A and B are shown apart, each in its own frame.
With several copies, the nearest count.
Chain A
């Protein structure tokens, strides 16, 4: 009825369990797909349930509950919150979930409850899943042990850098800023050609973070420190403009603010400066933002030092802040502080495994089919004899042994023939079969080449990454300075 345990030998076991789990399978991203497990489950699940960009929106609660019943044994609210975030275009550079309804705002206010909103995968997230049906990625069992789920996704683009991550575990934490899709691909593509590229050359392609919120990034030197070691301190400052007004008064207008900053609160803290007369000359603060543009008007008084006021807001509010790179991620089951190079290499590494796996899958499919198509071509020239032979057989199995023995068809061919539907005896035309045979041969040749030549496989990897760039590429939002 009892059994004693040491307080040491027990906090040891208990905490080690929580430690490991919350590090591997909760708070930190996989280095290759750039996803935390919950994020991966949401994606994999919605995809299985056919809830994609090309098809209707699906009531959010339906997706959440399915995720919870099949893959993620945790709170409906955690799952939804995660799902909501993936859909906010001020947190993700490239949103992975599109959502109908109130999904929040930069004012930090709450999204509509899960019963109100509809959602589906964005078109680009589909590229995170591309080729999953093709045995291209290691699966594992879910908690039920009733269904298999992916441990990583195929990632047809480098999501760790593009969307970022953040990031609180046990003993480790992670902060990775978002990046411009095209810049990241341009980098990756270069490194494919140049395995030993060094940070400086890579920075000619990937100059730095690109925040969805825009604004100005200052600190080339630190960006490099970050891209090199995983840590770095950089300055983000809001995008401002000065409008002149009637009555000789000038006015500061804010149009982009720093990533991860709450517009509503920022506005209060600025108005708080005015209230407390901490700097001389602020008339009134107004959030003038509306459904299609961010705009904070800070109207000054007549005869007021406009540069004085702007410098104070930068120093003493969040009009300007420090972003801290702390790029940690999960590489070979372990938390690892990493810079631009282990990241991109790990990605290329992974995209290689996927493409090869894919091509093996497709080759096998094509071989099998070619094999059947070869037999069907033969069968046509002996159509009548084959019918006669089947008529002469006692049952299906006997028909096959007859087909083999008498015409040297193979099991797989004989089964194919014997299970043809009668009406097929009317499409007796060799030439289209001979055209399929040819397409099939070519296809196999192309895949064998991928499989048996690293240069050919990387060239595929480059063709493909460039297609993704052409398709989803967009302009920088954040500008740089040193």
Chain B
């Protein structure tokens, strides 16, 4: 399922979780094969806060992560026997991209906390415009435009320099700050109960 790094090296080696085969393929091309592996996520990732742990485990995307990271799941989980120094979630800069980042994160919190609390889980920041700009703010400042509809229409030369190059890339580090404020947050947004989510949405989402 996955395209692996050339050398096994739990100290440099990075796992790129890419949203879609489209981008999955542009990453295989754009990458540095020595220490960079690619694992496509084909479809919307299961929700590990809502699903029965029966199904949760009979799930292809979920199996090949437990098994591609090689540390096992839950508390049977040994961070010391890991396979990657970094784990990078690279999605489209769209909303469904956001949604996928969201489902992955809850899985890594629910079932591999060591990793999130160890600061090994990151999130890529692809550019939104083309010099390159990430914010509608740093754009008109660059007016001194090729709006990226998704990782798709980026070309390996660009993807490398902009977002995969360890020397040129911006890269968000996921960090549990308040264990209890984090469990509440996750369980409201992603849990079985609809009503509190709706409430949250009303309280926090500004429709204008």
Count of chain A residues with a beta carbon within 8 Å of a chain B beta carbon: 53
Instruction: Determine whether the beta carbon of B186 is less than 8 Å from that of A11.
Output: yes
A21 / chain B contacts, CB cutoff of 8 Å: 95
Instruction: Determine whether the beta carbon of B149 is less than 8 Å from that of A143.
Output: yes
Instruction: Determine whether the beta carbon of A19 is less than 8 Å from that of B205.
Output: yes
Instruction: Determine whether the beta carbon of B26 is less than 8 Å from that of A112.
Output: yes
Interface residues of A in 134-160 (CB under 8 A from B): 143-145
Instruction: Determine whether the beta carbon of A15 is less than 8 Å from that of B189.
Output: yes
Select B182's contact among A7, A19, A116, A287, beta carbons within 8 Å.
A7
- A112–B160 CA distance with the chains assembled, in angstroms: 17
Q: B185 in the interface, Cβ–Cβ < 8 Å?
A: yes
Q: Do A171 and B109 form a contact, CB below 8 Å, given A6-B177, A101-B22?
A: no
B5 / chain A contacts, CB cutoff of 8 Å: none
Q: Residue of B at shortest CB range from A109?
A: B25
- A292–B31 CA distance with the chains assembled, in angstroms: 11
Instruction: Determine whether the beta carbon of B172 is less than 8 Å from that of A6.
Output: no
Q: A18 in the interface, Cβ–Cβ < 8 Å?
A: yes
A235 to chain B, nearest CB (A): 25
Instruction: Determine whether the beta carbon of B147 is less than 8 Å from that of A1.
Output: no
Interface residues of B in 176-208 (CB under 8 A from A): 176-178, 181-182, 185-186, 189-190, 194, 197-198, 200-202, 204-208
B37 / chain A contacts, CB cutoff of 8 Å: none
Q: Do A334 and B201 form a contact, CB below 8 Å, given A8-B178, A113-B22?
A: no
Instruction: Determine whether the beta carbon of A101 is less than 8 Å from that of B207.
Output: no
A464 to chain B, nearest CB (A): 32
Q: A455 in the interface, Cβ–Cβ < 8 Å?
A: no
Q: A245 in the interface, Cβ–Cβ < 8 Å?
A: no
A12 / chain B contacts, CB cutoff of 8 Å: 185, 204
Q: A246 in the interface, Cβ–Cβ < 8 Å?
A: no
Q: Residue of B at shortest CB range from A100?
A: B153
Instruction: Determine whether the beta carbon of A291 is less than 8 Å from that of B173.
Output: no
Q: A-B contact count, CB below 8 Å?
A: 159
Q: B29 in the interface, Cβ–Cβ < 8 Å?
A: yes
How big is chain B's contact interface, by range? 35 or more
Q: A73 in the interface, Cβ–Cβ < 8 Å?
A: yes
Q: B166 in the interface, Cβ–Cβ < 8 Å?
A: yes
Instruction: Determine whether the beta carbon of A288 is less than 8 Å from that of B175.
Output: no
Q: A22 in the interface, Cβ–Cβ < 8 Å?
A: yes
- A223–B26 CA distance with the chains assembled, in angstroms: 38
Q: A17 in the interface, Cβ–Cβ < 8 Å?
A: yes
Select A172's contact among B95, B102, B198, beta carbons within 8 Å.
B198
Q: Do A6 and B26 form a contact, CB below 8 Å, given A11-B106, A18-B102, A144-B147?
A: no
- A40–B153 CA distance with the chains assembled, in angstroms: 25
- A67–B145 CA distance with the chains assembled, in angstroms: 22
A12 to chain B, nearest CB (A): 6
Q: Do A7 and B185 form a contact, CB below 8 Å, given A73-B149, A286-B6?
A: yes
Q: Do A110 and B21 form a contact, CB below 8 Å, given A145-B147, A292-B157?
A: yes
Q: Which residues of B contact A (CB under 8 A)?
A: 6, 21-23, 25-26, 28-30, 32-33, 95-96, 98-99, 101-102, 105-106, 109, 116, 119, 122-123, 147, 149-150, 152-157, 160, 166-167, 169-178, 181-182, 185-186, 189-190, 194, 197-198, 200-202, 204-208
Q: A21-B95, A116-B22 are in contact. List 12 more A-B contacts (CB 8 A).
A: A1-B169, A3-B172, A6-B175, A11-B105, A12-B204, A14-B101, A101-B26, A101-B154, A112-B25, A291-B29, A332-B207, A333-B207
List 19 interface pairs A-B (beta carbons < 8 Å), by A numbering: A2-B173, A5-B173, A6-B175, A11-B105, A11-B185, A15-B190, A17-B95, A18-B102, A73-B149, A102-B22, A102-B29, A102-B152, A112-B25, A144-B147, A170-B197, A288-B33, A292-B157, A333-B207, A334-B207
